[model samples]
Target chain A: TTALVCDNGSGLVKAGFAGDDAPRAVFPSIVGRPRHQGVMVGMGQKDSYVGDEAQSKRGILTLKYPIEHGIITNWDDMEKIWHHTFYNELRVAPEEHPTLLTEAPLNPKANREKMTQIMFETFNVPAMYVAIQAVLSLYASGRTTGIVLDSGDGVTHNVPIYEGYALPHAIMRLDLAGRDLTDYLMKILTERGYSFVTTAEREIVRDIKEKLCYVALDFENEMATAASSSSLEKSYELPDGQVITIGNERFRCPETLFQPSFIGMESAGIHETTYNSIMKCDIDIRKDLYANNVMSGGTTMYPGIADRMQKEITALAPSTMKIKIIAPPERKYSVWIGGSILASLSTFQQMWITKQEYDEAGPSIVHRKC
Target chain B: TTALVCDNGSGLVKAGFAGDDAPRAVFPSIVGRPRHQGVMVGMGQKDSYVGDEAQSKRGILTLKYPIEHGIITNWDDMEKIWHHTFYNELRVAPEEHPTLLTEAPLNPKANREKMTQIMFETFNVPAMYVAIQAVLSLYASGRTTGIVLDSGDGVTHNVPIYEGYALPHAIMRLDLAGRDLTDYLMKILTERGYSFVTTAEREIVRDIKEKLCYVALDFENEMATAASSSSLEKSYELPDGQVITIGNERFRCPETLFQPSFIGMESAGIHETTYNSIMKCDIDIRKDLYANNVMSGGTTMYPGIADRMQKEITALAPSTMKIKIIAPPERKYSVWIGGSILASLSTFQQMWITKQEYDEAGPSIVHRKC
Candidate 1:
């Protein structure tokens, strides 16, 4: 039997013999360990344990976020958690079976080499295949030419997928994403007089932002409305029935994505940034790519974001050009679903680089295959 | 000889015996108006604009604070600028001998009843005896006994002068004075980020607070080191090359006077709220006269204050204490400097009525005397 696997710091891992309902199970690219207890081992253990149990027992644990911004910054911690998560979740002996793994676009050559060495030395799978997630996502979509705007947790990545592979020249990265937004929110709250002692209040502020926050249609107008004292402003009722006004000014929380200049940082706005990334693709591919601009990831859940993107992209494009923003049915699961479809394909066997080749070629093999 | 003076409000005619100075020169309590071109007011001629003339000409109008703690809340624009200040400063007015004028302690009654009226009425005098500034200052000190802490523009008055005068009670206003401790440096610059659009950065917060901002020696060590980030954290440098690193957190801006929780409203930190008339009094006095704490009108010079006060005061005081904070100082000239001095004076010229007499004589008669 073949098994597909993915790990933190890389992309989706899909592998299994022939056809299977799923390639084992999908895992997030996050790692952590308990403060008091030893390392957490296994697949589902880290997610279930960390998200639920460890959070409740947070005091006793010093959970570390080893993988930051989709890259492994702390290799020691990453290696330990990788071993623990793989062991705990798979519960398979070294010689049990072959494995297929995914990696990031233009994966840093040094990091790729290290990853291959780890799999060979530690897991010792009989065979393995390494693939980039963007290519796999494109292959899963069965699209010859299109743009994928992936707004992931730590950072946003945009890639142009063409002819069943990612267009290397068209791939781009932004310095901001979910974490940056959260940090901005935290600063606003602190300035408003919430302190470390007011833990409950802090949590409530986060909750409010999550549930009630929305992208503004006209950020300046929305900001003025939010900041204004008018009663027309929308507010949220806290658990105790205390009403908090969350007007356009407050709701402009998500405006950072479009206009980072509001926070004293300059960047290509969402539409311009996406458009510029798309333009970098081959001229003949641009038409098809614009017709199928796909958006996925956690941030796409914000209300009005896709419509706003559509409007903004249309305005920026030539009048003759048609702009489309594809809304995923289940945004949070798009990447995972794409991985699942790719793993089930019989032709996918050709993509897997066997364990023998991995061992012989080592980390440099990823560059050779690409 | 007497002259009749008239303006937007009340008109007055005084023929009192004059001294070396002009017996009467009308000084309407109004603020912020242009001076007269012939009999008609011009575009931008005003008097007694605060701060240096160079600064004012540079558009750095020190917001002329009107009414000091429960005085002259309704000195409309015409009254505050024209009658009160502009008219008084205009030396062209004809008068013969020196004059005697009275102002109020908690200046509300006197500002409305006599001071403004006396200013509008003209009397013959060669030189004028503007009521001794120091004596008026004594009235606002509110010290029947105990130390008086008077912080105003230019100087801070710390006097234990309590003999001969019939002392009211042991009044204890705080040691912190607004003019002495408000470091407007940060506020002025931060506001410049917004204010530069319409006006030049006129009001650079003064260095008074940095030079003289101190707490009782007892709190020096505790406050100084409380929020210090490191052993050497006692100093920080501003962009202007002025370095002020405070060792005591208690004496820091927003920590000393506002006391975080003294007022029920939250956010104006202790030192910040210290500038507010209601919060500046001793805690004991604040508690005793919680209901009778009349409003004082002066500019709360700190930027972004309303919100700051709401948050800081709520955090400082206990949830149960009944507190009321009124704005707009009562007397522009004398109230804060006169409240208790007037309350304790033996030769008040039948100006005062005891609480018992006020109850018996009725509000009309009390209003007439006041």
Candidate 2:
């Protein structure tokens, strides 16, 4: 039987059997219960829904995110989500499969233990492995070592990996990412008199951002282009038969990733943070980190993102050093793909923390095995 | 009948009846469950403990924090802590009294609604108000207009207030604060060969920090003074009967608040963030924002914190403007105090969102009433 690989991200959950090229199911990492629980009970539609179905409920149900900043903050809701992922989505019994879960950089020991406890005690998985998402992404890029820039919906992590191990001290995170960009775009649209205020309305704006937004190579020149001509402009049609023009905002919103000062954040931009993170590592590995910068996560899927990132890092780095960014086409699912590859390997089966080990030593055994 | 006032901070919960000068009960806003559930069940010790008792059961329990960065992340654990606070600590039945809860600045609407729903539906409170902690702190300082700098265990918020309304756009947050300082101190001690690495050991380091750490008015001069003399150094004895010497780290740990770059964060220092936040407000109110800056939260208790803040802000602001920092003796309890004052007021009775109103309008009424 194929093992289960689940990349449970803050924004999305990618789940499938091991050795798969792509996840069998991909959906938003959210759960929703009826706004009026009593009425829902009377109607007999089950208590809650997970993933896309949860989002579909919209105004009818109150949606909740179980994960935030790549950590499971709401265990009950997360349990529901995972239950759906296993029983409904994947159509697999947890006890039958070995599970591989993904964790973001700097995940606390407590969180790791809690995760292990749930997998063994509740799900009754045969074996499990909690792998760092950054390391997994690096592996997905077919690299043994690299600096992984994973810009997910909730946050961005710049993790420097030496072989399979991540340098915890050198890892940097940016609180601004895809969701912030959506909010920024929403702000721009609201100021332009095209209002999208509610949570459901915000989702519409998010879709607009995803379809139309692009990174500009030269921000100043693009601004000038937007001002002089309509060529740089985009018009998005709303579900209500209304249209909104997105002009300089396409460049301006993404520009925050390069210069966070635009959003009033005191934190350095992605490029600067990447440079700073690399600098924190040992001098001997600096060039290797710079030369093989790997882009992962959906936020990094923006067109021209890699080119802009490369240009910015090059300007910051020494002129003598060469900088290359590996932007794989499947970067959005890289973490899951990596897990798939790892779990599929016959030799890697020995690496999993077995149920017997958990039974003997409890969740603390995760620290040793993982 | 007096209302129940609870200032649920990330690190601590201050609970008491309204109009009280101080909280009757102050405890860590955390819950701990038995590590070995079956063993605990047989021992007849019950399931979990909240606050100081939770910490007291150190090795036997697995501690969990419900709040992080001033927001309630775990509803279940938070429910346990609140249950203990109401029944065991304050000894109040929810049905008899109105409740006033403190929320951090920029709290999401969903969180507010969820809280309101809990108070009314779960606790069956008669009336409730979710007030922003920053605004409440400003109120406690006897000002309707000021920039409130509230630094707690998990995070710091620089919120600009004008005539009782918080200017949400101008609000800025720094992820570094008291907890980070404690971690920094632990790191400093570890590098000095004094290992206090576990969660319980870190709490010991935190205690040492609270007793000895002070902000230096002049960091460079303090560094020079520490180099020349042992006067700035102190000795701390662990429970294990091992003594560790704390030297420049006393000042160095607190210095992170002034210069976050020391901690690899690119965010501006507290003073600079204060200046930025004030500058973001209306030009006419900028001086007013500066004239009465209110300091609130546990982290601001350092001896010369207010003086250092005033000096740095004055250096950044226009020379003609006055930078007054109001460091109330009870700043750490300012938020709770303000809630007490508000709830006790005869005129404030009408302001409470009654249970009937909630039943009619539902939890959505929080946005309007709050």
Candidate 3:
């Protein structure tokens, strides 16, 4: 049987066979354990490890995320653990089948080379295919020209697709994403006198944001409502007994995507950044691209985001230019769908560079793909 | 007429007649404003300006402490505004009188000399007297033998008084203090999705901490109870009509004074630090000193602080060692009291190094004071 496809992004890891009913499983990329000695293996399970399960074990352990910002920063014990989890879930020797992996758009050649080397040396995968998420999205959408917004936990990368290939010059990335939102939430809770350090208060806050948090279309008005002391704006209870009030404290976090100035940042908002990326392309390409603009990412799941994006981009575009905002059915799973599609394609097979290619072609093959 | 005394410590500033009725005013030394253009002034006034008025305007403005971690980091417009507020509050001409200012203990000589020059030139004060807060606390307590604990916003500094003078060699300062607590709180809140970029939300969180926050004697136990969703934790009603549960989180904050490791620090608790400072003194001097341990600064105002401190020190001290934790009736005003006492003492005149001696001895006069 052909190997199952596993795409690990900042938020979650998606794994399944190309034509299986659905991906076998999708798990968060974080691992946590108790800080106290002898508590590492809990519940008397020798191979006890936690993923979503570990989220419940707050205060007893400090949560550690191996990926920081967007890239793998600390890869010592975390890397080993990640690989062990991956191998255990896949339940197959890498030498038995070829593997296909997805990386970010225009990823540094050095990082790709290192990743390829690791897959070959550690997992002993005989052959490998590497492609960016943007390229995979193009395959899934069947679009020749459009702007692809891939928002993940660590960073949001915008890629323009032309003729089923990513336009490298039009690719842009911002140093903000889901993690920043979580970090901001944690700070607010702490200042409110709910310490997450020795409590599960952080988890409750995070869950509230994930389940109920929404992007406000009119940030100023929403801020006014949030900042009001009215009964309507006061407190809301969570599925848990925890309650949080929307005080006169206006939440302009989602506004950060539009106004980086709110966070002392110099970057343009998602809409402006997307417009700029499109303008940088050839004029003829820009016209074709505007017709198929696609918003796909975890962040796109936020309420009013699609409508807000459309309104902003419409204002920025020339009256003569027609703009459309196409949102995938499941924005969060778009990239994974793209990956699965790419893996199933016969023509994509040519992109697969075996371990022999590395020994023979060396790192030069990365430049050829670019 | 003598110049007004301006004792700018890490937490608060006390400015008024040195020996008058409780000084002119006591205000927290933080100034916060919106991160917008031309937003001049901070907490001090109904409008904007720094210091006392700035604190009163906490919920109205985005909070920014011009001084961070006990150092004046915001020297641009923030400094100019602060200087204007100070001069305006004093309502005195620069040439009217000389000024005496207090800084942290063992402050770098360069910073002292630079500050003296600034006071003389900027405010146009004819003369300036600068000394450490620890020295002033010793003078205020009217004690010849005791350990002085100046636990303020940025750092906790301990100094031993020997023969009626601060022993510089026996002085120790730890980076754990109230400011660190605020910063840690900020970090935790941000992670919890409380948008700091939204000035109103930021103020709500900050105000909650200032009003309902407290220190826990048994931090771990309190944290465990709070984390477990028990009713034992306290909840506060916000201005927005939202009620927020506050207990484990509040305790986890001030709890930093005991467990620095929670914030990735490896330092002794405040009690241990106090005892260590006394132990470094001559053995004969340490005997009577243990019974006179003095706690001064804003942090000592927390409920149960005195009793908790006494219990912790008693546990750490020798069985025969008698420990007494004495906080001034007005913990917040103790520093000013010390400054007032210092200004009145006949020995105080000797403490002053005239501009003439400063010119002759140069910046080395600070070392001579020790």
Best by DockQ: 3
Query: Which has the greatest TM-score?
Result: 3
- Point to the candidate with the largest lDDT: 2
- Real contacts recovered, all predictions: 0.00, 0.00, 0.00
lDDT for every model?
Answer: 0.47, 0.82, 0.66
Q: Under the 3 Å rule for N, CA and C atoms, how many clashes does model 1 have?
A: 103
* Least well predicted 10-residue stretch by lDDT in candidate 2 chain A: A35-44
Query: Given candidate 2, what's the lDDT at residue B206?
Result: 81
DockQ of 2: 0.02
Q: Model 3 residue A267 lDDT?
A: 80
lDDT of 2 at A258: 86
Per-residue lDDT over B145-217 for candidate 2, one digit per residue giving the tens place of the 0 to 100 score: 8888989888788888888566766767677788888878888788789887666567778889998889988
Which parts of model 2 are misplaced by more than 4 Å? A36-43, A163-166, B1-370
Q: What TM-score would each prediction reach against the true structure?
A: 0.47, 0.53, 0.55
Worst 10 residues of 1 chain B by lDDT: B7-16
Clashes of each: 103, 0, 37
B-chain TM-score for every candidate: 0.31, 0.94, 0.85
